[PDB]
């Protein structure tokens, strides 16, 4: 049943790296 | 149906395959943050 | 009519061979400024 | 389908130019679009010929000369001019469409191109002569018998198991 | 490499073709999704796999391959070990991390230029030898397992062989093929109906037997290029540019993918049907078989039954081989599978056999294949174009053969656009056409 | 000198009302308590009957089978064998499926 | 000794079994032995269409025709009890087997004449006072020839016999009569009549081969055209067993 | 001369021969010359063909009773299907004739040389020195022609079912298909009819605007079209006054100022949709037919509510049933 909630986190795992990168710095 | 002792994870096993795709997706999120 | 069978090949081969031997002689030349 | 099946539109000259124009035009579009892109003067710097273009002033971006001398040798013909090229593209479609609108006008008063006597008259005898026309026309005849009853409900059509046309097998 | 001094965003990866690739890591980066994908789907597959339900009836694209290798199957196409399947995906999946864990690095924190760190073979495309030598490695690399398989085929467990004596069953390839006429002969074989140069393959003896020949043949190439520099008609002929290299290389896939799509739709040997669906032709032949029986069993003479058209319902005649099932089914008189071969004859289908030696184990396999046919909608409602929603099933072959074609097609589109742009550097007009020095505005007018 | 369709006409004999032992498709045999399966294979096989009863005297018929036929005799009829109806072993598979 | 994978493609399965020149050795028939035939095969080669003679009444002709449908011609796998009736002659009554190959030869002109080469419901007999099958022996008897097409069959435009549109159809207010020929589809039934002379016999094997000549009719086409006569020639094998 | 071939070598690659003939040329040029020749005749005068698995000859030659529309040179028979039926494999010339062997010749030939034209479509963009993402546009076309003549056949096993070369033939190949693939309900064909319709709309759009902001150079007696000379240095249209209009006509920003982009949009739209389409056929080639929602909408009791697609399907059966009457000797059209 649960399947959905656990998918949620992984999906927002990627844009979160973008966010954690916005704040800190680098990449550019 | 995975080995009995894994019963707990049918939920994730369920999603794992979507990921591949997910990458072409993200590739955009970044390109957008980096104003192209 | 087994004749035809061969009469063609040659006509086909000839060409296929003329095809390859034309591209074989490398075409990096035969354009603007032979480069 | 309903047209194909009852009006057998597919075989109506007018509709034909209708696809002759849409279809014919699409090519015309896809080609002028690409034909142009390739005969583009490198007038920018690098891998972005999309920016190198001047929104500001007149400067033929696609050598009209590298054009004709291309197809003239690859297809035998040259669209020498751009007023006509960029015009003939207006025509192609719009025209066909009309030829469609005419055609259908026909279908309005059931004036349709199903006919083709020359054939059907000789279709009577020679039970062994067969063209696609007939072979096709037959498909239609099935499309009727099967859908009419449910498509046209207000007629409360009723077709017993038997009356329905079918080949040996299904 | 930032924007300017690069391409636009959609041509992103082009700025990586500049200097020495900052990351091999890209390629490795995904060289992981590809292996991870096996890790997910394989897990996902078994994650949904029931042992009774016919493997092809449960959207199993991935799992059937393990089986075809002898794993978790044995007698009939029955699955005894739910374990082995699980194993392989679990491994790959996890295996992917290392592949991605590294590609992910090589692309951001390592040498943004391995052209300089060079040393180790290193980087630069025009470098005619670094490339001959590189592919050279990946050549020993492939042939490597060509044997890996031969091993599984000859030393670890065997493969699944539908032809195999008894019946479909995990068997060990004892005696692979020697004779080069055979193993090679296929290439020289007809391309059209009756004999596909690659596709036509009755047994494993010729498969694993042929693979062997390829491992060494392929290794002999890596060993080869690794040691030498390409000749002068080679250089003369082919443009050398990083891109141009992809250009060729890419059109080996295109072709190859078709060669797959065209293969997964046609063979019962390397694609058993006990794991994939019954092959298209097999189907409309299976139908035949089922009804030849239905009536013969109902009391009809069959063999001597004049059919509606003028041909005969149950039995008909082909031009070269004399006897086969007749319907519209004829197109597939080339179909060969263990479920119909016993009832075969010198001249073709034997009337005496078909009449009395046609056993039960066939009427039931024949009926499964009549039903389960490669026919379905994206909707996934397996059946004729116009069937009611209920029984749904889409043959692994449908998806397999279909996809690869669209992709392999598209790739051919690639082989073009990457050759089209690369053959362009060759003279420099790839960026465009120089406004003051164009070959045409200075040439003898055609007339 | 007035040629006419044969099946259409024989549809006008008793063939259209009941089951024709000598012509009728073997498919119309299910429509009665336990006849189709085997009895039919014998009904259909076994020569063409001149009399509707000669059915009962069929080689090897079973003491029970014999009975059945008797019982169902009501619905069986006959007309000249119809070349157009029997040729092509159509009687076994007329080309008519659901 | 040949496998299907060995013979397929040769277009051989359409040509049937030979008997090498160790023949002329008659087969010992009993009169005390039941005897049956095993796969009697008729492979053909010569199709002649009796030319619809022009109105003039001087010897109608038998022109030679070109084969069209490649190899779909020969017929065999025919079996039937071989009766040994009084006066010691043999009669072979075929019970079933592949025997109705549909062929279409191209006439002198451009005509496409299609017939149904067949030796069905066959009852062939030989000469009397024969205790042995040899180059002497021969077989003559009758046929049964239905029609090219079955009962169902829809000629383009939908017409048919045991089904089919039933009429002029395409033409609604057309003149009903004169299309009778086309609409009502009659179904033919006619006699064949072959002739079998042996030429190579093996004494033990029961095998015997020879030339044959069938004279039958062509395609009735429901009613279309009056059929054309046809003579058929070729060699035939036919193994005999007890 | 050192070798006489030297001249053959520059001629083939003559960047100035009235009609360029590349290396592809040397194959294209005749592959079509033979292909066409067989065709033009087969139409004008060619016997019927047993097409379908039986012996029902379908006539398709003007001299055999065809209107230009009914005209068509027919396929190879279900007898051959995929086997290669070249002119020599057939005994009598007439065999090849009857069993429909012209098809393969015509089809195989053009269907081949066609591609070489695709190559020689670019070979001139190399000798001429112009960007060459042009030859690709041509793909979509050739893909389809290949799809309707080579994939689908390999898909169903017989050249029998490959869009018969002729007008009314296509119509046939079509109506049948719908029936066996519900193509019309297929997501691909959609994206196909998508662009085609588009391109045909854009082809009239971009052609519309240009002529609408054409520029000055004429009287009213003179033909406005005359205002231009081949080899102009500056384009004839006033792009600014064009976008300045079209842009405005609903949204202003859904418009193109980037002539390079626009002319490009024209390229790719038609050329991309057409591809999907070409793939659509090639997709259903192995039976991944269009969608299917028959009986997919139902009420409580289960009484079934017809979907507007059930009609689609109704008219579909009418088609399924008839097509190829006589051969189909079994319940399921498994081919
Ligand atoms: C002879 C000269 C011909 C000149 C033609 C020149 C034209 C130029 C080429 C362009 C396209 C035409 C070329 C034809 C290639 C297609 C293959 C084909 O038609 O031949 C058909 C065969 C099919 O093999 C089948 O093989 C079967 C055997 O299997 C059977 O028997 C087997 C054992 O024998 C097994 O038991 C098995 O289970 C059982 O099913 C049967 O014999 C069938 O009759 C037989 O059809 O395919 C194969 O093996 C061949 C596989 C080749 C790879 C092709 C990939 C897919 C094709 C894509 C085309 C690319 C063009 C695209 C351009 C447009 C944009 C891209
Ligand atoms: C065989 C493998 C292969 C490899 C390694 C490459 C590699 C490359 N190709 Mg390429 N190509 C291939 C096959 C390949 N191609 C094939 C088979 C075709 C036929 C179509 C092409 C056609 C093609 C074109 C036209 C171009 C390239 C380009 C490139 C280069 C740019 C990199 C790139 O595009 O990333 C970036 C990835 C993208 C931009 C993907 C996004 C695409 C956009 C336009 C659409 C977005 C999709 C969207 C709808 C997804 C929905 C998400 C939703 C949630 C909103 C790169 C070297 C570009 C170049 O010039 O290189 C020299 C270029 O212009 N390729
Ligand atoms: C599909 C696979 C793929 C791969 C392997 C690459 C790889 C690359 N692209 Mg790229 N690209 C892609 C698709 C891809 N691209 C597509 C589809 C588009 C169209 C939008 C682009 C558009 C594009 C542009 C415009 C540019 C690149 C550039 C690059 C290079 C710079 C990488 C970088 O700076 O990341 C920076 C990374 C971040 C800012 C954060 C991302 C975090 C990632 C790397 C980690 C994710 C790992 C995963 C989530 C978890 C694993 C963790 C592990 C420890 C277990 C690199 C070689 C640049 C280039 O030119 O290189 C020289 C560049 O300018 N790309
Ligand atoms: C080699 C490519 C390939 C092929 C042939 C298949 C085939 C299949 N997959 Mg699958 N899959 C793949 C890659 C592939 N997959 C990848 C990379 C993932 C990870 C995201 C998955 C994740 C996945 C899941 C979760 C499931 C499947 C399932 C299936 C089966 C039914 C799916 C279906 O009917 O919907 C048809 C789907 C479509 C028609 C998508 C429409 C395509 C649009 C978006 C445009 C595509 C254009 C482009 C050219 C094609 C892209 C290629 C593809 C890799 C996306 C079918 C056998 C189902 C199944 O069988 O369960 C066991 C199922 O539940 N797959
Ligand atoms: C897949 C193909 C591939 C190729 C051709 C390379 C090539 C390279 N990698 Mg590499 N790498 C890969 C995959 C690959 N990698 C993957 C999948 C990962 C995931 C981790 C990495 C992670 C990685 C790291 C962290 C580094 C490299 C580095 C390098 C470069 C150093 C070459 C060297 O001398 O190593 C030779 C290595 C061996 C011969 C293997 C020896 C195995 C045993 C004997 C000891 C290895 C240590 C132990 C087993 C585990 C490794 C721990 C790790 C810290 C190395 C070289 C260009 C180095 C670099 O910066 O290059 C400029 C570097 O620091 N790679
Ligand atoms: C894996 C990828 C790969 C790539 C990209 C290359 C690339 C190359 N290899 Mg190579 N090679 C590889 C794998 C690869 N190889 C493997 C796995 C082996 C194992 C041996 C080899 C063994 C090898 C050798 C021995 C040689 C090469 C050579 C070459 C170079 C020239 C090849 C050429 O252009 O052929 C173009 C050839 C043709 C277009 C042939 C046209 C002539 C036709 C008509 C042949 C006639 C057909 C005949 C009748 C038989 C059947 C015909 C038909 C009916 C089928 C080129 C750089 C050559 C090189 O210079 O150095 C190695 C070379 O001598 N390779
Ligand atoms: C990203 C989308 C995608 C997905 C999910 C798949 C998935 C699959 N492909 Mg595939 N493929 C793709 C894109 C994709 N492909 C593209 C773009 C091409 C080029 C046109 C191909 C060409 C191709 C071929 C020729 C074959 C596959 C096969 C397969 C299946 C077995 C995987 C495999 O071979 O493992 C590891 C490798 C094998 C099991 C067999 C290797 C074949 C030998 C070594 C020849 C070379 C292999 C091939 C060229 C490398 C591609 C491997 C693949 C993982 C990309 C699997 C369902 C195989 C199949 O049909 O099912 C068994 C197969 O024979 N593919
Ligand atoms: C250089 C160009 C390039 C780019 C930008 C990418 C990008 C990506 N690849 Mg990839 N790949 C490439 C070349 C490239 N690849 C090559 C040459 C191979 C050799 C096989 C692969 C093999 C591969 C595998 C096995 C996998 C990826 C995956 C991915 C990621 C998910 C998309 C995917 O399905 O990939 C696979 C193949 C493709 C993505 C090819 C095209 C598929 C996309 C473009 C279809 C969806 C958008 C498209 C249909 C837009 C339509 C056009 C629109 C205008 C209508 C994505 C980051 C992972 C993935 O997520 O797959 C599910 C994954 O598992 N790739
Ligand atoms: C859990 C886990 C994991 C993780 C992972 C990952 C890494 C994932 C991912 C992820 C991701 C990372 C995904 C994705 C992505 C992305 C995204 C989320 C995106 C986005 C979105 C969107 C919606 C967008 C949109 C848009 C638009 C609007 C248009 C265009 C542009 C863009 C794209 C921006 C794995 C699997 C390894 C396994 C182990 C554990
Ligand atoms: C695209 C790209 C990117 C990235 C990345 C890539 C490309 C790649 C890769 C790769 C990757 C990303 C990889 C990986 C990985 C890892 C993984 C995938 C993992 C894992 C693991 C898992 C998943 C597991 C799980 C489990 C276990 C552990 C066992 C049991 C079962 C379970 C499930 C629990 C970006 C965007 C940045 C850009 C550039 C390129
Ligand atoms: Mn021409 Ca493909 Mn419907 Mn079975 Mn036929
Ligand atoms: Fe324009």
């Amino acid at each position: 049943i649960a399947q959905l909630t656990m998918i949620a986190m992984i999906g927002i795992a990627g844009p979160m790296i973008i966010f954690l990168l916005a704040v800190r710095r680098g990449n550019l | 149906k995975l080995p009995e002792a894994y019963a707990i994870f049918d939920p994730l096993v369920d999603v794992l395959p979507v990921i591949p795709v997910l990458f072409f997706a993200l590739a955009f999120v970044v390109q957008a943050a980096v104003g192209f | 009519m087994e004749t035809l069978k061969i009469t063609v090949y040659i006509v086909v081969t000839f060409f296929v061979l003329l095809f390859v031997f034309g591209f074989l002689s490398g075409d990096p030349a035969r354009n603007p400024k032979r480069k | 389908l309903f047209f194909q099946g009852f009006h057998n539109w597919t075989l109506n000259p007018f509709h034909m130019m209708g696809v002759a124009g849409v279809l014919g035009g699409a090519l015309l579009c896809a080609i002028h679009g690409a034909t142009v892109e390739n005969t583009l003067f490198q007038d920018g710097e690098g891998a972005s010929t999309f920016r190198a273009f001047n929104p500001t002033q007149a400067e033929e971006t696609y050598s009209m000369v590298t054009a004709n001398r291309f197809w003239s040798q690859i297809f035998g013909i040259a669209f020498s001019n751009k007023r006509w090229l960029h015009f003939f593209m207006l025509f192609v479609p719009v025209t066909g469409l009309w030829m469609s609108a005419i055609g259908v006008v026909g279908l309005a008063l059931n004036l349709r191109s199903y006919d083709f006597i020359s054939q059907e008259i000789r279709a009577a005898e020679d039970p062994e002569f067969e063209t696609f026309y007939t072979k096709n026309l037959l498909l239609n005849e099935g499309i009727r018998a099967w859908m009419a009853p449910q498509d046209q409900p207000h007629e409360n059509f009723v077709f017993p198991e038997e009356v329905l046309p079918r080949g040996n097998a299904l | 490499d930032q924007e300017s001094s690069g391409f636009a965003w959609w041509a992103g990866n082009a700025r990586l073709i500049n200097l020495s690739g900052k990351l091999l890591g890209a390629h490795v980066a995904h060289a992981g999704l590809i292996v991870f994908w096996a890790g997910a789907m394989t897990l996902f597959e078994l994650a949904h796999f029931i042992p009774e339900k016919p493997m092809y009836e449960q959207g199993l694209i991935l799992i059937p391959h393990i089986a075809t290798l002898g794993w978790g199957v044995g007698p009939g196409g029955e699955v005894v070990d739910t374990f082995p399947f699980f194993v392989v995906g679990v491994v790959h999946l996890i295996s992917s991390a290392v592949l991605g864990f590294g590609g992910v690095y090589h692309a951001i924190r390592g040498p943004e230029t391995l052209e300089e760190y060079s040393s180790f073979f290193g980087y630069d495309w025009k470098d005619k030898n670094k490339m001959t030598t590189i592919l050279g490695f990946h050549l020993i690399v492939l042939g490597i397992g060509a044997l890996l398989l031969v091993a599984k085929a000859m030393f670890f467990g065997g493969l699944y062989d539908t032809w195999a004596p008894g019946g479909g069953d995990v068997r060990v390839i004892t005696n692979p093929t020697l004779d080069p006429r055979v193993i090679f002969g296929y290439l020289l074989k007809s391309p059209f109906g009756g004999e596909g140069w690659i596709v036509s393959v009755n047994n494993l003896e010729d498969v694993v037997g042929g693979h062997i020949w390829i491992g060494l043949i392929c290794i002999a190439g890596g060993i080869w290029h690794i040691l030498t520099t390409p000749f002068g008609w080679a250089r003369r002929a082919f443009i050398w540019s990083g891109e141009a290299y992809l250009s060729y290389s890419l059109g080996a896939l295109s072709m190859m993918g078709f060669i797959a799509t065209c293969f997964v739709w046609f063979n019962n040997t390397v694609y058993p049907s006990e794991f994939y669906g019954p092959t298209g032709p097999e189907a409309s032949q299976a139908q035949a078989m089922t009804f030849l029986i239905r009536d013969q069993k109902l009391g009809a003479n069959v063999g001597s039954a004049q059919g509606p058209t003028g041909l005969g319902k149950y039995l008909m005649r082909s031009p070269t081989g004399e006897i086969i099932f007749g319907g519209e089914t004829m197109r597939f008189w080339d179909f060969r599978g263990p479920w119909l071969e016993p009832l075969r004859g010198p001249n073709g289908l034997d009337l005496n056999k078909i009449k009395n030696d046609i056993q039960p184990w066939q009427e039931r396999r024949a009926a499964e294949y009549m039903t389960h046919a490669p026919l379905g909608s994206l909707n996934s409602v397996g059946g004729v174009a116009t069937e009611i929603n209920s029984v749904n099933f889409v043959s692994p072959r449908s998806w397999l053969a279909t996809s690869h074609f669209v992709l392999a097609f598209f790739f051919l589109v690639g082989h073009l656009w990457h050759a089209g742009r690369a053959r362009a550097a060759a003279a420099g007009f790839e960026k465009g056409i120089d406004r003051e020095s164009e070959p045409v505005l200075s040439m003898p007018s055609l007339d | 000198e007035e040629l006419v369709n044969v099946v259409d006409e024989k549809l006008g004999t008793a063939y259209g009302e009941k089951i024709d032992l000598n012509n009728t498709n073997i498919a119309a045999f299910i429509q009665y308590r336990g006849l189709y399966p085997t009895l039919a294979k014998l009904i259909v096989k076994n020569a063409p009957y001149e009399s509707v009863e000669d059915v009962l005297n069929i080689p090897g018929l079973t003491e029970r089978q014999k009975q059945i036929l008797r019982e169902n005799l009501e619905h069986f009829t006959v007309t000249e064998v119809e070349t157009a109806l029997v040729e092509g072993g159509d009687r076994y598979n007329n080309g008519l499926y659901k | 000794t040949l496998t299907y994978d060995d013979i397929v493609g040769t277009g051989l399965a359409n040509k049937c079994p030979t008997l090498d020149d160790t023949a002329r050795g008659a087969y010992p028939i009993d009169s005390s032995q039941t005897y049956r035939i095993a796969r009697l095969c008729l492979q053909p080669t010569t199709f002649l269409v009796k030319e619809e003679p022009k109105n003039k009444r001087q010897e109608a002709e038998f022109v030679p025709t070109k084969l069209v449908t490649r190899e779909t011609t020969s017929l065999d796998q025919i079996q039937g009890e071989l009766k040994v009736n009084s006066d010691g002659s043999l009669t072979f009554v075929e019970e079933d087997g592949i025997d109705f190959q549909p062929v279409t030869v191209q006439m002198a002109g451009g005509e496409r004449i299609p017939l149904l080469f067949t030796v069905k419901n066959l009852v062939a007999s030989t000469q009397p006072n024969v205790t042995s099958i040899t180059t002497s022996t021969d077989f003559k008897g009758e046929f049964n020839v239905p029609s090219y097409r079955t009962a169902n069959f829809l000629d383009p435009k939908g017409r048919g016999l045991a089904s089919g549109y039933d009429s002029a159809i395409a033409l609604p207010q057309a003149k009903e009569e004169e299309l009778a020929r086309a609409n009502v589809k009659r179904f033919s039934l006619t006699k064949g009549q072959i002739s079998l002379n042996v030429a190579k016999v093996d004494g033990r094997t029961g095998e015997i081969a020879g030339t044959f000549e069938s004279e039958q009719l062509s395609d009735d086409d429901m009613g279309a055209h009056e059929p054309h006569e046809v003579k058929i020639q070729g060699v035939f094998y036919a193994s005999i067993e007890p | 001369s050192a070798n006489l071939w030297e001249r053959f070598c520059n001629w083939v690659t003559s960047t100035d021969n009235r009609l360029y003939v590349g290396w592809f040329g040397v194959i294209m040029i005749p592959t079509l010359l033979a292909a066409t020749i067989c065709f033009v005749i087969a139409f004008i005068a060619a016997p019927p063909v047993d097409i379908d698995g039986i012996r029902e000859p379908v006539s398709g030659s003007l001299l055999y009773g065809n209107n230009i529309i009914t005209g068509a040179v027919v396929p190879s028979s279900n007898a051959i299907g995929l086997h290669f039926y070249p002119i020599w494999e057939a005994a009598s010339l007439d065999e090849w004739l009857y069993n429909g062997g012209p098809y393969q010749l015509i089809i195989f030939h053009f269907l081949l040389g066609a591609s070489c034209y695709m190559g020689r479509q670019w070979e001139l963009s190399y000798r001429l020195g112009m960007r060459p993402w042009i030859c690709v546009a041509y793909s979509a076309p050739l893909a389809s022609a290949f799809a309707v003549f080579l994939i689908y056949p390999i898909g169903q096993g017989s050249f029998s079912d490959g869009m018969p070369l002729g007008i009314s033939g296509t119509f046939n190949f079509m109506i049948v298909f719908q029936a066996e693939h519900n193509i019309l309900m297929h997501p691909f064909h959609q994206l196909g009819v998508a662009g085609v319709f588009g391109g045909a709309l854009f082809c009239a759009m971009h052609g519309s605007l240009v002529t609408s902001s054409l520029i000055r150079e004429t009287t009213e007696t003179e033909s406005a079209n005359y205002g231009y000379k081949f080899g102009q240095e500056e384009e004839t249209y006033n792009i600014v006054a064009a976008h300045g209009y079209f842009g405005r006509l609903i949204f202003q920003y859904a418009s193109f100022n980037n002539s390079r982009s626009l002319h490009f949009f024209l390229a790719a739209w038609r050329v991309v949709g057409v591809w999907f389409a070409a793939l659509g056929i090639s997709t259903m080639a192995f039976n991944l037919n269009g969608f299917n929602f028959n009986h997919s909408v139902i009420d409580a009791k289960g009484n079934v509510i017809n979907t507007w697609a059930d009609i689609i399907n109704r008219a579909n059966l009418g088609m399924e049933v008839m097509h190829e009457r006589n051969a189909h000797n079994f319940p399921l059209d498994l081919a």
Side-chain angles (χ1 to χ4, degrees), chain D residues 4 10 22 26 32-33 36 38 40 49 60-61 70 72-74 83 86 89 130 136 146 150 168-169, chain H residues 18 20 56 59 67 120 124 133-134 168 171-172 175 200 203 207 224 230 233 235 260 263 270 314 321 328:
Chain D
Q4 151 77 321
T10 62
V22 159
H32 160 45
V36 129
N38 294 301
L40 232 192
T49 55
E60 178 171 281
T61 184
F70 170 65
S72 287
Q73 307 178 307
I74 186 65
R83 198 313 189 30
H86 299 21
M89 293 177 69
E130 194 178 298
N136 259 330
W146 290 76
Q150 300 165 59
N168 176 81
Chain H
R18 179 64 198 60
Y20 180 41
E56 152 188 316
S59 179
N67 227 30
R120 184 198 63 118
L124 198 59
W133 75 7
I134 193 165
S168 183
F171 289 102
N172 189 326
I175 318 134
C203 184
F230 174 68
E233 315 161 74
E235 307 162 311
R260 303 206 174 188
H263 268 77
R270 165 95 196 117
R314 196 51 186 167
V321 176
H328 292 140

Side-chain angles (χ1 to χ4, degrees), chain A residues 7-28:
Chain A
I7 87 155
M9 295 144 108
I10 100 186
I12 158 273
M16 195 50 163
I17 146 280
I18 251 57
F19 199 37
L20 279 201
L21 282 200
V23 271
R24 249 104 273 294
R25 81 338 337 118
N27 162 184
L28 256 174

